[PDB]
Design a binder for this molecule. Structure first.
Ligand SMILES: CNC(=O)c1cnc(Nc2cc(C)c(F)cn2)cc1Nc1cccc(C(=O)NCc2ccccn2)c1OC
Ligand SMILES: CNC(=O)c1cnc(Nc2cc(C)c(F)cn2)cc1Nc1cccc(C(=O)NCc2ccccn2)c1OC
Lengths: 258, 256
């Protein structure tokens, strides 16, 4: 399951963002490590249980491209997951700031590294369920000459099962359409993230309204094809409404290495 | 000497601070993110000292030395266009992270500062403004197994063009021989290592100009660093006799 952390061992620093029912802060863990604290909102037992399952999944795994989870601190109305601090933070933010100046090869190295960590979770028959640019952290940047990127996939936060329909609609286009009303969902998540990467942090449908987003899935519309034809075949296969028709990560990984 | 930049190619954004006769702003260069060092309305000797600074930085190349794009000169305007280093001045970071900066982190910063100064020593060039504020953090070195990465900024208006009042303001970083050679950067380095050790708090910093001048006039020596890891190096560097200061080749070997 997961390691337990005392309130005394953690220091909450600057605010980094807000997730689904969470607030993200930089922090210190006690000699002293830089950590990232995911503070759950005052929640019911079913919400908190979904949070512990997330901590468990991440605690019980080990992969070079998967972010480490130290444990969980239980403090009054808040629950605090203590996770790995990664030098450069989310990928989507860096993609928007570096818009137009990110090489194909850089995006191609990041695809393989994401497939590998997901291939690893596929072999263990485990589900991430929140693959998106925001959950991709850059350990090493790779935008500078002679540098190659190194990513770590973050924890998926509160499990998708505990979210309302409104919250699941907010996750379009990354949310697999079968989850709107299995490991197959991470292949859709992966395909949508590859489109976000290709479009330098701009996911299709991101700007559009919840009704427009729901309508797109309700009408079985397909997402745009990526700008780079090296991934067009892979994304079309991944972003199919039939879960069984999505390739395995073992296949995906072989297709990128060629 | 230096590259010339047109007024049209630069956009001045937010104000970051004030230096000796300058105002530091964030900006864009045609749009690449830069730092603009806007010289105050100055006389020709002041502007000439500003161009010499741009030259020194333009004509060098080092991994731990900040890049200078060029200078924009139009009417009374003198704008040095320099590299934007992600996290900014080291002294600011050090005060905000006071008590939580490891000894190992500081030695990295020290070796990298010593490297960019050994490089300038081999080319027989003078920086003349080594201080925490002129040390910029490119990479923070906060994640496990990662090291900080620094870049030494341009020294701003050359020390030669400054008044006595302005030189007194530079104590304890200003070498005492400059109060009334490459040897000065060894004092600058020594004083910066004390500032780093004391988490951004340089000794004498709070004290008055008369108190500061009095300290140098009376030949008093600066406090010894908290970490005995650098106590021998700083005592050697912060000697009033310029010739008695070790070379950066020596300093670098002592740090490795
Ligand atoms: C497991 N470790 C992590 O999560 C982690 C590690 N290191 C970081 N470093 C770092 C470093 C710098 C310099 C920096 F400026 C920012 N951050 C950031 C990390 N998290 C993180 C940070 C900020 C926002 C989010 C966030 O919006 N989360 C909620 C969300 C919204 C939408 C979709 C998905 N999730 C966030 O979570 C990914
Ligand atoms: C090559 N250009 C640089 O050095 C530079 C590059 N990147 C920066 N990034 C950055 C980033 C963040 C997040 C930030 F919040 C600020 N800045 C800041 C940079 N300069 C800079 C900025 C502000 C003040 C000074 C300054 O006090 N100068 C005058 C002075 C006073 C006393 C002693 C010596 N010099 C200053 O110059 C060092």
């Amino acid at each position: 399951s997961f390691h337990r952390v005392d309130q005394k061992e953690i220091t909450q620093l600057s605010h980094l963002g807000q997730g689904t029912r969470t607030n993200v802060y930089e922090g210190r863990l006690r000699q002293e490590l830089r950590v990232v604290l995911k503070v759950l909102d005052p929640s019911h037992h079913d919400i908190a249980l979904a949070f512990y399952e997330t901590a468990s999944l991440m605690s019980q795994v080990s992969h070079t491209h998967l972010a480490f989870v130290h444990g969980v601190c239980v403090r009054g109305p808040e629950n605090i997951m203590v996770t790995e601090y990664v030098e450069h933070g989310p990928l989507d933010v860096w993609l928007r700031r570096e818009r137009g100046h990110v090489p194909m090869a850089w995006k191609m190295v990041v695809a393989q590294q994401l497939a590998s960590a997901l291939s690893y979770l596929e072999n263990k028959n485990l589900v991430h369920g929140n693959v998106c640019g925001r959950n991709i952290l850059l350990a090493r940047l790779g935008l500078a000459e002679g540098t190659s990127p190194f990513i770590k996939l973050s924890d998926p936060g509160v499990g998708l099962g505990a979210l309302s329909r409104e919250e699941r609609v907010e996750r379009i286009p990354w949310l697999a359409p079968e989850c709107l009303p299995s490991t197959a969902m991470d292949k859709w998540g992966f395909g949508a993230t590859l489109l976000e990467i290709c479009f330098d942090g701009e996911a299709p449908l991101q700007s559009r309204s919840p009704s427009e987003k729901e309508h797109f899935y309700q009408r079985q519309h397909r997402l745009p094809e990526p700008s780079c034809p090296q991934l067009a075949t892979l994304t079309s296969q991944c972003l199919t409404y039939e879960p069984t028709q999505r390739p395995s990560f073992r296949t995906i990984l072989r297709d990128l290495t060629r």
